[PDB]
Design a protein around this ligand. Structure first.
Ligand SMILES: C[C@]12CC[C@H]3[C@@H](CCC4=CC(=O)CC[C@@]43C)[C@@H]1CC[C@@H]2O
Lengths: 247, 13
């Protein structure tokens, strides 16, 4: 299975946030650790994306674009999976050194978002998502959010996305077509559910960036730039998710 | 243009 072989081969390892668990939880400490984790994971997302079949055939400006728009969804989905596989969705496993119980969900001031992410995590159990389905789905999330006015080379993006949809379909395909159809429906619905969550997190981090000096939250280099230049394009509707089903 | 991100994308490592 050439494609799946590649996805498993390139899958990033464990990333720690660097969080001090010996200190009492505070809003500022938790969010500063999340922001650092974001920066660390972004580095891994770039190295991963570059190794995905067909990715480097995109225009370099489109490579930049998809990474800068898709990262929240990619990272949320992966965290949901870690949470499912490591703690049966009981807590949010952001990193081995940054695990959110309900108290931290409250302290973070992102409780509503956390609950939705935990629901997402539970869906991996409820649907019995396989590791191989997870890998293909995550890859597809990189190609699930683009500018409304299209990319630099839309045709190449369209072919790439089409081929990642095909690979997911093949992983699903089960003698009975009705089971394959129900499965594809379930998984595309799950994929779609990532985007509203990512949007709420995008809103939160944008607002937090705008007031970060007031609340003592540190944003690293790339994250602060992405959140001020790219994220508002999502928030203003210039960049939108590609949904399977209508919202 | 995000210079730091483009560097990561351009970098072989
Ligand atoms: C963007 C953010 C920092 C990075 C976080 C994000 C929540 C989702 C998330 C999950 C991860 O596993 C990596 C870090 C990220 C991507 C946080 C929401 C508010 C905070 O500013």
């Amino acid at each position: 299975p050439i494609f799946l072989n590649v996805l498993e081969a390139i899958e990033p390892g464990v990333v720690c946030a660097g969080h001090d668990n010996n200190q009492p939880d505070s809003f500022a400490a938790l969010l500063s650790s999340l922001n650092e984790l974001g920066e660390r994971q972004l580095v891994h997302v770039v190295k991963w994306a570059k190794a995905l079949p067909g990715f480097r055939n995109l225009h370099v400006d489109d490579q930049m674009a998809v990474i800068q728009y898709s990262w929240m969804g990619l990272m949320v989905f992966a965290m949901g999976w870690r949470s499912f596989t490591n703690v049966n969705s009981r807590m949010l496993y952001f990193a081995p050194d940054l695990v959110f119980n309900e108290y931290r969900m409250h302290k973070s001031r992102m409780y509503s978002q956390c609950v939705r992410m935990r629901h997402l995590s539970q869906e991996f159990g409820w649907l019995q998502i396989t590791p191989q389905e997870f890998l293909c789905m995550k890859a597809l999330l990189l190609f699930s959010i683009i500018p409304v006015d299209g990319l630099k080379n839309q045709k190449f993006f369209d072919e790439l996305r089409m081929n990642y949809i095909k690979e997911l379909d093949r992983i699903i395909a089960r003698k009975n077509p009705t089971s394959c159809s129900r499965r594809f429906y379930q998984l595309t619905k799950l994929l779609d559910s990532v985007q509203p969550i990512a949007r709420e997190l995008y809103q939160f981090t944008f607002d937090l960036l705008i007031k970060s000096h007031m609340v003592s939250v540190d944003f690293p280099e790339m994250m602060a730039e992405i959140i001020s230049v790219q994220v508002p394009k999502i928030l203003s509707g210039k960049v939108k998710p590609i949904y399977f089903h209508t919202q | 243009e995000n210079a730091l991100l483009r560097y990561l994308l351009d970098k072989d490592d």
